[PDB]
Amino acid sequence: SQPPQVTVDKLKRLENDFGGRIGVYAIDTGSNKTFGYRANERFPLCSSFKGFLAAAVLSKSQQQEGLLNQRIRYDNRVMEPHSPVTEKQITTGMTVAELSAATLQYSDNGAANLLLEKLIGGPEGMTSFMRSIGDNVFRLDRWELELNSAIPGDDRDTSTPKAVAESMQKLAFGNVLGLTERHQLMDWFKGNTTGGARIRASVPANWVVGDKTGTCGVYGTANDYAVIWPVAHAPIVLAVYTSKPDRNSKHSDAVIADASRIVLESFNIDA
Ligand code: NA
Ligand code: NA
Ligand code: NA
Ligand code: NA
Ligand code: NA
Ligand code: NA
Ligand code: NA
Ligand code: NA
Ligand code: NA
Numbered sequence: 336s337q338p339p340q341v342t343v344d345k346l347k348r349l350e351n352d353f354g355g356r357i358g359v360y361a362i363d364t365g366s367n368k369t370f371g372y373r374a375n376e377r378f379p380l381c382s383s384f385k386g387f388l389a390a391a392v393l394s395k396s397q398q399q400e401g402l403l404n405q406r407i408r409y410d411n412r413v414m415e416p417h418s419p420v421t422e423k424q425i426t427t428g429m430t431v432a433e434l435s436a437a438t439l440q441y442s443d444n445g446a447a448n449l450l451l452e453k454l455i456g457g458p459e460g461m462t463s464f465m466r467s468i469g470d471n472v473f474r475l476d477r478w479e480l481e482l483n484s485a486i487p488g489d490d491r492d493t494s495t496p497k498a499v500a501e502s503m504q505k506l507a508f509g510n511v512l513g514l515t516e517r518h519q520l521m522d523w524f525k526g527n528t529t530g531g532a533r534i535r536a537s538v539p540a541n542w543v544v545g546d547k548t549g550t551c552g553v554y555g556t557a558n559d560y561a562v563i564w565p566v567a568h569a570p571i572v573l574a575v576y577t578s579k580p581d582r583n584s585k586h587s588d589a590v591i592a593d594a595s596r597i598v599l600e601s602f603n604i605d606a
């Protein structure tokens with residue numbers, strides 16, 4: 336049993352080298368072993384909320400039959416940066432399921448804002464959904480892209496590593512979504528395209544990982560949260576969030592990967 340103090344000191348050295356703050360929370364879903372470091376401190380969500388937005392859409396669909404196959408047109412809409420899928424499909428519109436997949440797997444901003452506008456009731460509505468699953472920490476205050484400002488000590492558009500991990504655990508393995516909807520959500524996480532250098536980089540290529548990244552573009556602020564399915568072990572839920580004090584500092588994918596490696600080494604997994 337690696338003493339938790341050992342794990343904490345490895346993370347302190349890592350965040351000192353990085354020049355900022357690293358916050359982590361992990362849960363072993365078989366043993367209920369947990370580990371946290373800065374787990375109750377707030378960090379900006381950046382795009383990480385989009386995974387929960389997809390979940391909010393699936394939840395909504397459980398009380399509105401047919402919702403996922405409905406199409407949303409936006410032919411004369413002003414489109415946001417980092418909207419690769421919705422920019423491409425503007426001539427056709429997209430179904431609610433397609434928007435949800437895009438916002439999670441490609442971090443698509445147009446898709447996020449469209450779903451917040453037309454289905455989820457804005458940042459307020461997103462926040463209310465999280466409250467409805469027992470998350471009293473998450474808060475979405477602003478839309479894309481202004482939510483990326485990541486100002487030191489601004490609690491808007493933040494959560495904590497613990498609350499992110501706990502909410503991921505609730506959605507992946509709990510009671511919020513029915514079986515079909517829960518499978519859909521986790522398949523979307525599994526097919527995420529933006530996380531190859533973050534938590535996925537800390538585990539063997541043959542383990543299965545579902546994740547969603549966040550990158551604010553300022554204040555060295557970036558993150559990842561995931562479910563990890565090791566070979567012959569219960570799944571692990573992990574959240575890793577970072578920040579740096581200078582606005583022009585870049586984040587580091589390597590640092591997120593290394594934080595993930597340190598934390599996972601602390602679970603008794605065959606790798
Ligand atoms: Na110490
Ligand atoms: Na529901
Ligand atoms: Na459904
Ligand atoms: Na799709
Ligand atoms: Na709020
Ligand atoms: Na405001
Ligand atoms: Na849970
Ligand atoms: Na085993
Ligand atoms: Na499982």
Ligand code: NA
Nearest residue numbers: 356578579580
């Ligand atoms: Na910080």
Ligand code: NA
Nearest residue numbers: 579580581582
């Ligand atoms: Na400073």
